[PDB]
Design an enzyme around this catalytic site. Structure first.
Site, PDB file in Angstrom:
ATOM      1  N   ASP A  70      -7.471  -6.023   0.851  1.00 15.59           N
ATOM      2  CA  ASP A  70      -7.992  -4.775   0.295  1.00 15.59           C
ATOM      3  C   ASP A  70      -7.323  -3.618   1.027  1.00 15.59           C
ATOM      4  O   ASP A  70      -7.345  -3.550   2.258  1.00 15.59           O
ATOM      5  CB  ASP A  70      -9.509  -4.719   0.427  1.00 15.59           C
ATOM      6  N   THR A 119      -6.756   1.980  -5.130  1.00 15.19           N
ATOM      7  CA  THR A 119      -6.691   2.737  -3.884  1.00 15.19           C
ATOM      8  C   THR A 119      -5.262   2.800  -3.358  1.00 15.19           C
ATOM      9  O   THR A 119      -4.805   3.848  -2.886  1.00 15.19           O
ATOM     10  CB  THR A 119      -7.624   2.114  -2.843  1.00 15.19           C
ATOM     11  N   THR A 120      -4.537   1.682  -3.438  1.00 12.01           N
ATOM     12  CA  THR A 120      -3.159   1.659  -2.960  1.00 12.01           C
ATOM     13  C   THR A 120      -2.214   2.363  -3.925  1.00 12.01           C
ATOM     14  O   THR A 120      -1.117   2.770  -3.528  1.00 12.01           O
ATOM     15  CB  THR A 120      -2.700   0.218  -2.736  1.00 12.01           C
ATOM     16  N   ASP A 129     -18.659  -0.267  -9.475  1.00 12.88           N
ATOM     17  CA  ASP A 129     -17.302  -0.302 -10.010  1.00 12.88           C
ATOM     18  C   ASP A 129     -17.314  -0.537 -11.514  1.00 12.88           C
ATOM     19  O   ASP A 129     -16.407  -0.094 -12.228  1.00 12.88           O
ATOM     20  CB  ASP A 129     -16.486  -1.383  -9.302  1.00 12.88           C
TER      21      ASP A 129
END
Lengths: 518, 534
Positions: free
Chosen positions: A48, A81-82, A386
């Site tokens: 993650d 997120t990345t 989510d």
């Protein structure tokens, strides 16, 4: 101490390039694993992106700004997120040779990034395709993207029902030319707050409209539900009140001793009589209730709830409208108990609860979750947030955009076409934006194992001649159309992705010096 | 791309370190495998030397900074809780699988394709796992087959001389606790006790329970056959007044009268106990009376109980009192006033085995004990530690055989056949992928490490035995019949593992192939190593 000249611009780009370089292998469903070495004998195998960079200690302050950038993205979107960090780090890397080797002033580049940001948002809106937000079967296949590869894949149909029924309760969809358009405002944070109940089955999980209370009813035999309720909220306990000054009652005469003992019971009845003046059907107090007040209010035909938290009564006041009034003699008639459907005390999991659930949607709801254990409830919890975050982005815009590098390449091709028609010195840094957009799909190719140079040029040829919906497959790794296997994600994810990326990139380009002092 | 006080290994350099990290841990544990394995020393730092062949005890006692060996040790700990056997087998499969993968990494093959080739071959391995397994009957008369399962768990960690000693002990320990039906088995009912002063080859099985404190008096009977059991909770020793007082004697003989008057309260309960023996089988032969009493007993009552020929125990462990209650059947008696002959239990011959320092009383020959005991004997702490590893892993090995009706033949029969299976199947099927062929071929060639290192520790040429077994399998397929072939470590040729009696548990091999695949997969997924915050 001090970094002057172009040295500060190098350290700002290098720090952002190092943070992105770590998570380059963290992009995609096939993304690799990152083994972190702790100062102790432990290790972290989690892939993650947020859990990795959090465990990585950084020195240069620009790396800390990239960490705070991911914290803002986590509050907006649940996934990707990345994607934002790699994109924001590549823009500074592509603008690095133009800032130094080409000797372009940074303000010129910053003004060029603002023009590239506006053009990028227009291209994303053109490549986005609409979808029906009212179709229940379509919303389940959308949220399912954030569902699979998790333990909730088996209950995914029930996970989407808990996600949709929750946001549809708190959402207010309105528009007109008179009072203005809220633009479909949805608040997941405050209104959708959840209560997790252990035991039971996921099928038994319901979304209740109201505030849920874990405390029971003071007496077993009482009205279970009231047609048109009247609710009174007060923090003060229910018991015999005493004066704030010195109170001493001296009894000499024999027949005056039993009279004072009766007055003490009348004062308890008097405090309850002041409540009954408005004829309430429900009484909720923060502290405990004396046994005398229980009997006086039982014959008064009202419901009594005790040991209720103060933070809960504050959420009750918004869905009800009853304002907390400390003293029973100050109780107003303006605050009412309207829009409360049922008082049902029904026992859930061998524990007596209290239901404020109603038939209306006062912009809030309380989700009741059931599971096989607390770890299952925690898995349902974070997955439900989510799940609703994806449904939120679909309700905040009708259009869907293709993923897997399709939109990333679709923008880079259009930026290259607008670059030829854009005169001026800002043209050179404007081409660096399109080269940074190609890094995301090439990253998925590097993680797939294919040739990054060969597959990228062929993927670009598919966008130039054919449509823009041809992406890269996650399972296979070969160029395919995204219409075949939908990876499709909402546009709001792509909106805030490039939005905050330019804002974070320009913020580091504006800093020409770094000094230390307090 | 660096900041102060940080270290990073990037761009395939972490793979060369991680694969070498597995080769270092493999070569250490490559020495001990099968019955031909080796013994190692574990120093706890306190000066106590412990010799064990169990990979479970090894990985816990050693400290390794290499993070690759940490994940192997942590995952093997999960395998040690589930399988309980084959800790080295899992490590040898992980290391060699990374060695075969590292050769393809140097060829430029992406690790995802390598890991995908392992998962596809693992799913096909599970299909052959159900086909190759042998279904064993549920009959409990299978002790002959249990003798083969026992030698599998024994011969590995012992010289094979303790095998014939521990074979009837472990096999009788499981079937005595296990009732005849399909229900379950309890390993807690088998006690593990260690004693010194006698050779380890004299280790014997205890059908009943063993205890330390015996009856202390020279005239107490040493051997009492078929005696009734009394579980007593009340103190038979001298007692004192609960409040502060004193004994004032006017005459010298009055001092003994005041002491006898205070003990008379205990002597009153003493008379009720000895009257129970006089009431039931006082002079009757082949019948006796035993006092297991939990609290202390003064030497005066021990002398009285000795004249009656009563075995009197004092200061007994609280856990053993409840265990002897179920074994013997006699209820716990708190007060002597409620003592009755119907409460008394029954036991067989109770005889004291008395060494120089200690006395051992045996509860054995019980009607319905439902609890066994394995008394481990040894001269030093080396034999006590090595035998305890064989008993704990030996009981859990047979336990998985009764729980799981499926059994698989050992001696590399599962590894050599499956490696030959994926070789011939992938060529005939060809339904995976062209680039996946590397991951499938590497996985099939990596499983050969167990049959190769098993004969390598035996000393025989591994190239010779793997050729004869492969030729025998090809001759078996040409004859068109089912033949199970396995390696023979003593002779060096092939053999039949079903006839030789070498068997491997199904649940052990199921989690070994699946576990070792998941371990090596997560290690290949690591591109870069990062050290921060130090």
């Amino acid at each position: 101490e001090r970094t002057t000249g172009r040295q500060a611009q190098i350290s700002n780009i290098t720090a952002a390039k190092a943070v992105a370089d770590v998570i380059r292998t963290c992009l995609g469903p096939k993304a690799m694993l990152k083994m972190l070495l702790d100062p102790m004998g432990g290790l972290v195998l989690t892939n993650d992106g947020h859990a990795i960079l959090r465990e990585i200690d950084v020195a240069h302050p620009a790396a800390k700004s990239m960490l705070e950038l991911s914290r803002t993205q986590d509050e907006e979107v649940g996934d990707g997120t990345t994607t934002v960090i790699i994109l924001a780090g590549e823009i500074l890397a592509q603008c690095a040779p133009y800032l130094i080797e080409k000797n372009i002033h940074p303000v010129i580049i910053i003004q060029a990034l603002k023009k590239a940001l506006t053009d990028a948002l227009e291209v994303i809106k053109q490549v986005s395709k609409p979808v029906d937000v009212e179709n229940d079967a379509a919303m389940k296949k959308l949220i399912q993207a954030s569902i699979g590869t998790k333990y909730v894949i088996h209950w995914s149909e029930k996970m989407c029902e808990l996600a949709l029924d929750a946001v549809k309760t708190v959402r207010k969809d309105l528009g007109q030319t008179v009072e203005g358009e809220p633009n479909f405002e949805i608040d997941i944070k405050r209104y959708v707050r959840v209560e997790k109940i252990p035991g039971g089955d996921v099928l038994d999980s319901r979304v209740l409209k109201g505030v849920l209370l874990n405390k029971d009813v003071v007496h077993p035999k009482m009205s279970r539900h009231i047609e048109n309720p009247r609710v009174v909220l007060l923090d003060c306990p229910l018991e015999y009140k005493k004066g704030e000054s010195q109170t001493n009652i001296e009894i000499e005469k024999e027949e005056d001793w039993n009279r004072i003992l009766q007055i003490e019971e009348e004062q308890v009845q008097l405090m309850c009589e002041q409540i009954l003046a408005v004829r309430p059907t429900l009484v909720i107090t923060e502290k405990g209730v004396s046994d005398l007040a229980q009997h006086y209010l039982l014959k008064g035909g009202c419901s009594v709830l005790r040991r209720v938290k103060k933070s809960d009564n504050n959420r009750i006041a918004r869905v009800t409208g009853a304002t907390i009034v400390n003293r029973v003699e100050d109780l107003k008639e303006s605050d009412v108990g309207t829009n409360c459907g049922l008082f049902k005390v029904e026992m859930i999991g061998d524990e007596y609860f209290s239901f404020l659930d109603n038939c209306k949607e006062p912009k809030a709801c309380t989700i009741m979750l059931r599971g096989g254990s607390k770890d299952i409830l925690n898995e349902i919890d974070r997955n439900l947030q989510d799940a609703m975050a994806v449904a939120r982005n679909v309700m905040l815009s009708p259009s869907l955009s293709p993923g897997g590098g399709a939109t990333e390449m679709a923008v880079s091709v259009k930026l290259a076409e607008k670059a030829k028609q854009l005169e001026g010195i800002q043209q050179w840094p404007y081409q660096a934006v399109a080269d940074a957009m190609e890094c995301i799909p090439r990253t998925l190719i590097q993680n797939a194992g294919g040739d990054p140079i060969r597959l990228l040029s062929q993927l670009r040829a598919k966008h130039a001649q054919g449509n823009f919906t041809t992406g890269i497959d996650g399972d296979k790794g070969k160029i395919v159309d995204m219409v075949s296997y939908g990876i499709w994600e909402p546009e709001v994810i792509k909106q805030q992705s490039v939005k905050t990326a330019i804002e974070s990139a320009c913020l580091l380009l504006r800093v020409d010096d770094i000094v230390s002092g307090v | 791309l660096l900041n102060p006080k940080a270290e990073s290994l990037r761009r395939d350099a972490a793979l060369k370190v991680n694969v070498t990290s597995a080769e270092g841990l493999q070569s250490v544990l490559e020495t001990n495998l099968g019955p031909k394995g080796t013994l190692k020393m574990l120093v706890d730092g306190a000066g106590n030397i412990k010799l064990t062949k169990d990979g479970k005890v090894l990985l816990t006692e050693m400290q390794i900074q290499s993070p690759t060996a940490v994940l192997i040790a942590r995952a093997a700990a999960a395998q040690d809780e589930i399988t309980g056997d084959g800790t080295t087998t899992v490590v040898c499969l992980v290391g060699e699988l990374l060695r075969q993968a590292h050769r393809f990494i140097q060829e430029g093959v992406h690790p995802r394709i390598i890991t995908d080739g392992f998962e596809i071959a693992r799913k096909e391995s599970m299909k052959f796992l159900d086909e190759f397994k042998i279904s064993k009957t549920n009959l409990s008369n299978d002790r002959e087959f249990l003798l083969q399962v026992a030698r599998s768990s024994l011969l590995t960690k012992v010289d094979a001389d303790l095998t014939e000693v521990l074979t009837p002990i472990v096999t009788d320990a499981v079937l005595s606790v296990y009732d005849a039906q399909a229900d379950n088995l309890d390993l807690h009912m088998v006690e593990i006790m260690q004693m010194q002063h006698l050779s380890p080859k004299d280790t014997t099985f205890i059908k009943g329970l063993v205890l330390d404190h015996g009856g202390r008096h020279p005239d107490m009977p040493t051997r009492v056959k078929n005696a009734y059991v009394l579980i007593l909770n009340v103190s038979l020793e001298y007692e004192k007044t609960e409040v502060n007082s004193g004994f004032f004697y006017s005459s010298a003989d009055q001092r003994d009268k005041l002491a006898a008057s205070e003990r008379k309260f205990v002597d009153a309960k003493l008379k009720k106990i000895i009257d129970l023996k006089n009431e039931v089988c006082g002079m009757d032969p082949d019948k006796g009376f035993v006092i297991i009493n939990q609290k202390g007993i003064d030497p005066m009552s021990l002398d009285v109980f000795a004249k009656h020929n009563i075995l009197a125990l004092r200061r007994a462990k609280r856990r053993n009192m409840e265990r002897l209650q179920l074994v013997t059947g006699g209820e716990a008696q708190n007060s002597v006033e409620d003592l009755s002959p119907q409460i008394l239990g029954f036991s067989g011959l109770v005889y004291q085995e008395t060494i120089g320092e200690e006395k051992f009383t045996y509860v054995t020959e019980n009607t319905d004990p439902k609890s066994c005991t394995i008394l481990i004997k040894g001269s030093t702490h080396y034999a006590l530690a090595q035998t305890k590893d064989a008993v704990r892993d030996g009981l859990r090995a047979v336990a998985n055989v009764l729980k799981d009706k499926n059994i698989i033949p050992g001696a590399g029969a599962f590894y050599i056949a499956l490696s030959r299976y994926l070789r011939s199947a992938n060529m005939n099927k060809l339904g995976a992928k062209g680039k996946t062929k590397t991951g499938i071929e590497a996985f099939a060639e990596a499983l050969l490490v167990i049959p190769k290192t098993l004969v390598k520790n035996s000393g025989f040429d591994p190239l010779d035995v793997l050729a004869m077994v492969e030729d025998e399998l090809d001759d078996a397929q040409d004859s068109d019949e089912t033949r199970y072939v396995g390696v023979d470590l003593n002779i060096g040729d092939s053999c039949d593992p079903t006839i030789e009696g070498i068997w491997d548990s199904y649940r052990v091999l199921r989690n070994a192939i699946t576990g070792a695949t998941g371990i090596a997969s997560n290690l290949l997924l690591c591109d870069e190593l990062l050290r921060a915050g130090r």
